[PDB]
Amino acid sequence: MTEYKLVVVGAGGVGKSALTIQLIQNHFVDEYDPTIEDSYRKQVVIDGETCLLDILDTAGRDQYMRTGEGFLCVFAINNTKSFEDIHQYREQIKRVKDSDDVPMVLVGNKCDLAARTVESRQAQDLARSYGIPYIETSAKTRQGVEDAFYTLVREIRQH
Ligand SMILES: Nc1nc2c(ncn2[C@@H]2O[C@H](COP(=O)(O)OP(=O)(O)NP(=O)(O)O)[C@@H](O)[C@H]2O)c(=O)[nH]1
Numbered sequence: 001m002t003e004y005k006l007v008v009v010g011a012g013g014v015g016k017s018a019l020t021i022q023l024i025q026n027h028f029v030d031e032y033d034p035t036i037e038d039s040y041r042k043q044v045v046i047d048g049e050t051c052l053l054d055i056l057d058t059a060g061r062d063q064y065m066r067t068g069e070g071f072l073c074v075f076a077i078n079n080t081k082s083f084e085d086i087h088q089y090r091e092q093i094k095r096v097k098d099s100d101d102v103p104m105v106l107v108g109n110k111c112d113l114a115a116r117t118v119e120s121r122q123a124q125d126l127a128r129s130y131g132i133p134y135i136e137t138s139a140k141t142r143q144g145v146e147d148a149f150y151t152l153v154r155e156i157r158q159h
């Protein structure tokens with residue numbers, strides 16, 4: 001079956017693992033557990049198409065960026081530093097893949113938190129400048145999780 005090689009990147013602690021575990025294991029990991037490198041393979045049905053999601057959950061590079069087909073670039077809405085770091089991930093991915101239009105979704109996670117420091121407007125404008133979608137998520141409530149991953153799969157389909 002069709003396989004989608006997804007890679008989740010972003011600053012340490014923004015919720016890359018929490019988002020992935022929510023999608024695949026249907027629960028919120030509310031504990032400290034830094035990632036080195038974890039892989040998740042799951043058969044799913046997206047828009048009627050049977051496919052395999054091969055998700056690489058990374059640590060907060062060139063090798064995995066090269067094989068990845070789509071990227072979720074994640075930052076946390078209560079961590080301005082993580083938002084400012086997005087540019088560096090974006091540039092490295094573009095360089096390694098020799099492409100300025102790589103399937104990608106900008107993800108603003110932890111949207112359940114009231115202590116926001118990154119305005120949705122600034123993230124939206126950045127995404128617009130990259131020509132990619134901006135989606136806010138909460139690995140805690142599961143809001144926007146399937147949306148983020150499925151949108152990424154669709155971006156790959158339309159590449
Ligand atoms: N309130 C809230 N907390 C979240 C959310 N996503 C993750 N967290 C919390 O943020 C912390 C770090 O999440 P984690 O998934 O481990 O982040 P990571 O990006 O995978 N870290 P690392 O790069 O080191 O692998 C955890 O305490 C986790 O519960 C979210 O949407 N909302």
Ligand SMILES: [Mg+2]
Pocket residue numbers: 016017018033034035057058059
């Ligand atoms: Mg992690």
